[PDB]
Amino acid sequence: AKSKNHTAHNQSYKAHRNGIKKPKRQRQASTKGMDPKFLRNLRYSRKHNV
Amino acid sequence: VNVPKTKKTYCKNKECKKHTLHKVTQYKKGKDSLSAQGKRRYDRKQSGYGGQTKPVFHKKAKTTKKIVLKLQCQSCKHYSQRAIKRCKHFEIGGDKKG
Amino acid sequence: GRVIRAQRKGAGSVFKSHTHHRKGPARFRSLDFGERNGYLKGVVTDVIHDPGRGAPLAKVTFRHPFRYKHQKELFVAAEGMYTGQFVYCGRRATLSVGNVLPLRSVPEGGVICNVEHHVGDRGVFARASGDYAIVISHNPDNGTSRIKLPSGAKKIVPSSCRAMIGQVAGGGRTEKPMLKAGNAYHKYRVKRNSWPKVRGVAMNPVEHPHGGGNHQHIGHASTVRRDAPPGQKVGLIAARRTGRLRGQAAA
RNA sequence: AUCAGAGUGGCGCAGCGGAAGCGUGGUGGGCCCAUAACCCACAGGUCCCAGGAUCGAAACCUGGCUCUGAUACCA
RNA sequence: AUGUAAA
RNA sequence: GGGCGGAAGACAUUGUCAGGUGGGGAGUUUGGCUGGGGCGGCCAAUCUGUUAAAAGAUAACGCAGGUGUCCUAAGAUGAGCUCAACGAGAACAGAAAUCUCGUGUGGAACAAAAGGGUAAAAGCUCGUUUGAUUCUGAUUUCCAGUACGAAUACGAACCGUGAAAGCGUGGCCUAUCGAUCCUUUAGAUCUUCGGAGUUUGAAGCUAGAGGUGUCAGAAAAGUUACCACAGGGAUUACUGGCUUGUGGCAGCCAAGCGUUCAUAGCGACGUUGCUUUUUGAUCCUUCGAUGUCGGCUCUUCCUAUCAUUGCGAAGCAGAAUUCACCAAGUGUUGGAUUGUUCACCCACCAAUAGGGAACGUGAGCUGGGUUUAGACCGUCGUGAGACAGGUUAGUUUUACCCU
RNA sequence: CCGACUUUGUGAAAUGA
RNA sequence: GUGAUUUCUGCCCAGUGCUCUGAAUGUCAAAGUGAAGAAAUUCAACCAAGCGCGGGUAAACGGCGGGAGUAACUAUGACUC
RNA sequence: AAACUUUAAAUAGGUAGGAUGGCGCGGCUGCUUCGGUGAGCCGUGCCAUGGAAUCGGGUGCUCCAAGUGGGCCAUUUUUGGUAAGCAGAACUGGCGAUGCGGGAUGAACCGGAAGCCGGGUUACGGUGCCCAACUGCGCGCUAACCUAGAACCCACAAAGG
RNA sequence: UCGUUCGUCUGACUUGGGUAUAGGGGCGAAAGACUAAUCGAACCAUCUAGUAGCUGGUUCCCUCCGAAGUUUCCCUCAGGA
RNA sequence: UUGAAACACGGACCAAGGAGUCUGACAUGCGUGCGAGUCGACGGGUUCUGAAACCUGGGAUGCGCAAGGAAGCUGACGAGC
Ligand SMILES: C[C@@H]1C[C@@H]([C@H](O)CC2CC(=O)NC(=O)C2)C(=O)[C@@H](C)C1
Ligand SMILES: [Mg+2]
Ligand SMILES: [Mg+2]
Ligand SMILES: [Mg+2]
Ligand SMILES: [Mg+2]
Ligand SMILES: [Mg+2]
Ligand SMILES: [Mg+2]
Ligand SMILES: [Mg+2]
Ligand SMILES: [Mg+2]
Ligand SMILES: [Mg+2]
Ligand SMILES: [Mg+2]
Ligand SMILES: [Mg+2]
Ligand SMILES: [Mg+2]
Ligand SMILES: [Mg+2]
Ligand SMILES: [Mg+2]
Ligand SMILES: [Mg+2]
Ligand SMILES: [Mg+2]
Ligand SMILES: [Mg+2]
Ligand SMILES: [Mg+2]
Ligand SMILES: [Mg+2]
Ligand SMILES: [Mg+2]
Ligand SMILES: [Mg+2]
Ligand SMILES: [Mg+2]
Ligand SMILES: [Mg+2]
Ligand SMILES: [Mg+2]
Ligand SMILES: [Mg+2]
Ligand SMILES: [Mg+2]
Ligand SMILES: [Mg+2]
Ligand SMILES: [Mg+2]
Ligand SMILES: [Mg+2]
Ligand SMILES: [Mg+2]
Ligand SMILES: [Mg+2]
Ligand SMILES: [Mg+2]
Ligand SMILES: [Mg+2]
Ligand SMILES: [Mg+2]
Ligand SMILES: [Mg+2]
Ligand SMILES: [Mg+2]
Ligand SMILES: [Mg+2]
Ligand SMILES: [Mg+2]
Ligand SMILES: [Mg+2]
Ligand SMILES: [Mg+2]
Ligand SMILES: [Mg+2]
Ligand SMILES: [Mg+2]
Ligand SMILES: [Mg+2]
Ligand SMILES: [Mg+2]
Ligand SMILES: [Mg+2]
Ligand SMILES: [Mg+2]
Ligand SMILES: [Mg+2]
Ligand SMILES: [Mg+2]
Ligand SMILES: [Mg+2]
Ligand SMILES: [Mg+2]
Ligand SMILES: [Mg+2]
Ligand SMILES: [Mg+2]
Ligand SMILES: [Mg+2]
Ligand SMILES: [Mg+2]
Ligand SMILES: [Mg+2]
Ligand SMILES: [Mg+2]
Ligand SMILES: [Mg+2]
Ligand SMILES: [Mg+2]
Ligand SMILES: [Mg+2]
Ligand SMILES: [Mg+2]
Ligand SMILES: [Mg+2]
Ligand SMILES: [Mg+2]
Ligand SMILES: [Mg+2]
Ligand SMILES: [Mg+2]
Ligand SMILES: [Mg+2]
Ligand SMILES: [Zn+2]
């Protein structure tokens, strides 16, 4: 009758049955959000390669 | 809460683009116009029978209002407005703390 | 809520006047040349009891002024008329009890009954049992007159209006206690269905504003506005005061 | 049992931090032969008990005490 | 407003 | 004499708008949580410490408390100083006024709650100031890895301060706040009014405010005992169940009472248990109905024994009375008043013990109470109405089935 | 309930323009 | 509304309601008037009843208090604040 | 001493254990430095015995969608309560969704998870009868004139003699 | 409804026929009574297969895979995303 | 329903009727035709059992091939690891 319910019961069991999904390790880890001062320069340097 | 009559702040008008010298006023809502779309819609909807059509607000719960300062810089005479935090006692250029 | 007893009376279904054994309207003669410029002799034939009304009614047999037949008129009895009496109708009829005269012929202080209001409306004031009006003054520059009515109200009336000299008979009728639900019932049977009357405080809210409550009480002010909608104008309509009257308040 | 309200001069009561009064009562004169009454002066209080903040408390918050007033219903 | 019981 | 006779008369009145009144009437609402609901409160937004079990997460109407603000300085920066307290001292000066020196790890202060943090400072004083600014992104916290609030780190501008490095995107950090639509303001010498222009107005774009505290944000009072429908044993009142605080019962030790004497008979301070007739707690069965108090009737069982049979002990001389033992076979009454269980009197008695059996027992009775609709009083409510206030009247259905 | 317009025409005076 | 008869119906007009009075310089609509405007429109004055302000009304709805001390036995408290 | 702490466990927590590494050479940078000084990248060439143990194909990527969102029991930690077959939490498992063998009977206690059959051997539990298995081989303790005592949960008994 | 026992019985009396009042209406000596076994809003048809977060039911076999009572928000707690 | 043989509710028995269908929009998945196209769906001509079938238009009807803005408007200059 107590309308408020909250348990962590069964929660690890549900979590671990599709595994703890680690996202795929990627070559060229993303540069989103890095220092734009550094990113501008890196983009210019890739612009002027030979 | 006290605000100086005049403050040095940024002016985004293309011809100032720098901290210039701004007067201070206090924002007061302009009186509601009778030709706004919301009013020639509310009046029309309200005409006839059916009574009150748009809700009317009753449960007022706040007790303060966010003051808006209309800073006018005297280098281009263009206002720009900044909101200060909620306050009850508010005064521009009041006698300073002793 | 539902329609109140006081609203229900406007249809007449069970509230019309019980008018089966009444003897017709009680009123004067048609005002005409003779009754305006002279007098007409009528002989009173019988004083009949009119059911539903407190006053006796005097049947009077005139002769038709311009065609050969009688006229049985029926007057309201003024105290004193007896069968065989000659009642005179017109302007220059002498001032005696039972005669009917215009107010231009009745001196100040005269006691009259069955007064007209618009000259020729055939007598409307001072008709109930034992009621009279006292003719107070005459204005001959207007051709008008003043009278004190049974209510004490003082009215200006045209001076050419007729009026029966005397007072209505049956005086003091209401002086007798009835002592009985019986006498009350037989009084109101021949008048109309307005008896018995149930206290609204002993009703249910759906039919009366006073009804309801664990105890019997009105609940709010018993006096209502003049403009209250019908079905709410119930109680003391537009009262100017209340409470037992003392002193000048009863004048 | 909960929830309010109030604890201030001897009694009943006013009080908005600088901070204590009102009537009356008491004390000393005065009038009277004497007592009132009346006139003129005089002295007041642990601001319920214990803390804190506050320039600044009796007031502000809290804990403890005592009285009063409410609400304690459908079975 | 008033006036020892103590003779 | 072309006026039927009077009265009022361009006022009443008729129609359309306009404002006020209008439970007479219509339509509708009258939040949520909740150890049933109602009243109370906010555990609905939200912060600190704990519970929280040494990563994170973590609940209850758990605990101790806080928030709807305050601030042109109590924000930014720089510089100088060190704080509370103690010790010795100096006219009036005392426990306490002002000054000086010594010690001083923070025992002070930092707007506030509590925690954390800070000492040539994040505190105190002083100088100068407005980074409490502009543009849009990114991340963290809650998170579904949405929003909001708050915070953090860069970027592009413009500035404050310092000599400079730097520090500064409000408050030393953790809470102190807000959607859609509408209105209103700021900005571009911006866009549209769709036949083309001038020209008011209006409509836009970007960024703020007007506020929703039920705080991811309807516009909203009661009553029903005349009530109704859907349902609920997710949820109350009767019985039952676990528990036994509470009610009842009985042990242990022995300070004393018992004129001397702890234990004949009690046994305080303590302490251990038993019981399910009370009351409390819970909410497990039962709300497509288990017929609800009491009494009458009648039966059965329990012993925690009142008499009755047999005994032991005494502060048992006899008589009577008290304590205990084996003992439930037998008995435990007539009445006043109350519906009462209970109570309390009168009297008898050998005795007028306690209890259980779905608080035994309504297709066994009664219907006094309670518990519909009538009605009255009182208190309450403005009113409908309410009362775990009082009073009166109020339908008690079926067995023939199985056992 | 009262206000205005309407049926609502005629001429006369006194105060405002 | 109360309920034959007898006897009597005490105080309160602050509250709610009802009603009465309108000097006018409170508030107060549509109409109607003036001004600004190129016009829409805005602004002003004027502005009825209603409300407000002012009186009456309780056989109108209703309501009708506390705390202390005091008598020469004690008790109470006629009395006093 | 839960809202005290200097110290400080166990259990659990995070990260790393290579082929997505390293070095050399010459090129770019609008960043960065007093500066080839760095930081990063680009082209090229070389090396890198697989860099603890054990185990194994993977949500690895995506789409569409069902039902569910009333839970309960147990051992340990644990809040309120006197306690509760009570209310609320933590890690885990069970029941629900589950039969089967044992605990006499019981949803969650013990063993154990299952296609249908034959054979063998077991787990828990027992071997007096009910009831398949010994009145088996040993050693003591108990004598109950109270229903002696006799199964993890469990169906309880204490203080004291 | 039946039996006995009761109330009134010259009266506000008992009653037949005619006639009037019809649903938010009637009528009520007032019980929310009566209005055709229906009344705190009759009955008949229609809108109508009203709506329902609630109760009940929901039809053949085998094989294979096979859970949840937990987060967040909601006038949200018997519900839905 | 956490939990049913339950003292939870429905079921006396039989037979027949009896409950996720139709339509619109959308979407994923799958099959077919064509494929920068693709649809002939409203009409027209035919149609010797025919409401069928077959033919016809389309040079712009629907969707798709261009998107970003509120709007005026502008509208992809050709990719490396
Ligand atoms: C006084 C105004 C009231 C309110 C607004 O007008 C109510 C609207 C908003 C809404 O929810 N939809 C509506 O139709 C009503 C608002 O915005 C506040 C800021 C201030
Ligand atoms: Mg739940
Ligand atoms: Mg707008
Ligand atoms: Mg219109
Ligand atoms: Mg209108
Ligand atoms: Mg009648
Ligand atoms: Mg009468
Ligand atoms: Mg009457
Ligand atoms: Mg009544
Ligand atoms: Mg009414
Ligand atoms: Mg009433
Ligand atoms: Mg003196
Ligand atoms: Mg004297
Ligand atoms: Mg005297
Ligand atoms: Mg209504
Ligand atoms: Mg609720
Ligand atoms: Mg409760
Ligand atoms: Mg841990
Ligand atoms: Mg932790
Ligand atoms: Mg410094
Ligand atoms: Mg965010
Ligand atoms: Mg910076
Ligand atoms: Mg600071
Ligand atoms: Mg900060
Ligand atoms: Mg906003
Ligand atoms: Mg146009
Ligand atoms: Mg919310
Ligand atoms: Mg209602
Ligand atoms: Mg009733
Ligand atoms: Mg007990
Ligand atoms: Mg006890
Ligand atoms: Mg239950
Ligand atoms: Mg039930
Ligand atoms: Mg049943
Ligand atoms: Mg039964
Ligand atoms: Mg039954
Ligand atoms: Mg015994
Ligand atoms: Mg029975
Ligand atoms: Mg009864
Ligand atoms: Mg009743
Ligand atoms: Mg009352
Ligand atoms: Mg009662
Ligand atoms: Mg009741
Ligand atoms: Mg009566
Ligand atoms: Mg009054
Ligand atoms: Mg009054
Ligand atoms: Mg106007
Ligand atoms: Mg006026
Ligand atoms: Mg480790
Ligand atoms: Mg289930
Ligand atoms: Mg086998
Ligand atoms: Mg055998
Ligand atoms: Mg009979
Ligand atoms: Mg008849
Ligand atoms: Mg008849
Ligand atoms: Mg009937
Ligand atoms: Mg259907
Ligand atoms: Mg239906
Ligand atoms: Mg259900
Ligand atoms: Mg769902
Ligand atoms: Mg259940
Ligand atoms: Mg059962
Ligand atoms: Mg059911
Ligand atoms: Mg059945
Ligand atoms: Mg095409
Ligand atoms: Mg490639
Ligand atoms: Zn400027």
> C135 near C46, Cβ under 8 Å?
no
Q: Compute how many other C-beta atoms are within 10 angstroms of the C-beta atom of residue B69.
A: 21
Q: Classify the C-alpha dihedral C152-C159-C117-C82 as positive or negative.
A: positive
Query: Is residue B50 in contact with ligand 1, taking CB distance under 6 Å?
Result: no
Which residues are registered as beta bridge partners of C101? Answer: C163
Torsion of CA C46, C51, C56, C57, to 10 degrees: -50
Torsion of CA C244, C248, C250, C251, to 10 degrees: 180
Phi, psi of C73 (to 5 degrees): -85, 165
Give the CA-to-C1' distance from C237 to F345 in angstroms. Answer: 65
Q: How far is CA B90 from CA A41, B85, B93, C122, in A?
A: 49, 11, 10, 83
CA-based nearest residue to C125, from C139, C143, C112, C108:
C112
Residue C215 is assigned to a ligand binding site:
no
- Separation of CA A21 and ligand 4 centre (Å): 64
Q: Give the residue carrying structure tokens 């007072």.
A: C167
Q: Is A45 left (phi over 0), alpha (psi -120 to 50) or beta?
A: alpha
Structure tokens that stand for C2 in this block: 């539902």
Give the CA-to-C1' distance from C218 to F367 in angstroms. Answer: 38
- Name every residue whose Cβ is closer than 8 Å to that of residue C233 and which is 6 or more positions away in sequence: C224, C225, C226
Q: What is the DSSP letter of A14?
A: H
How many angstroms separate the CA atoms of C158 and C86, rounded? 27
Strand pairing category for B2-3 and B91-92: parallel
Q: Which nucleotides of H are covered by protein (CB under 7 A)?
A: 1-3, 13, 16-20, 41-42, 56-62
C185 Cβ contacts chain J strand, under 7 Å:
yes
Which positions of A make up the binding site?
A: 5
How many angstroms separate the CA atoms of A34 and C98, rounded? 125
Strand pairing category for C236-237 and C223-224: parallel
Q: Give the residue carrying structure tokens 């909101």.
A: B83
Instruction: Give the largest Cα separation in chain A, rounded.
Output: 75
Structure tokens that stand for B92 in this block: 């521009």
**3 state SS of C162:** strand
How many angstroms separate the CA atoms of C29 and A2, rounded? 93
- Separation of CA C134 and ligand 46 centre (Å): 39
At A44, which helix (H) or strand (E)? helix A36-47
Write B84-89 long-range contacts (CB < 8 A, 24+). Answer: B84/B1, B84/B3, B87/B1, B88/B63, B88/B64, B89/B1
Q: Which residue has a Cα nearest atom 2 of ligand 1? A: B57
Instruction: Compute the residue count for chain B.
Output: 98
Instruction: Compute the residue count for chain A.
Output: 50
Residue B87 is assigned to a ligand binding site:
no
Q: Compute how many other C-beta atoms are within 10 angstroms of the C-beta atom of residue C213.
A: 12
Query: Is residue B49 in contact with ligand 1, taking CB distance under 6 Å?
Result: no
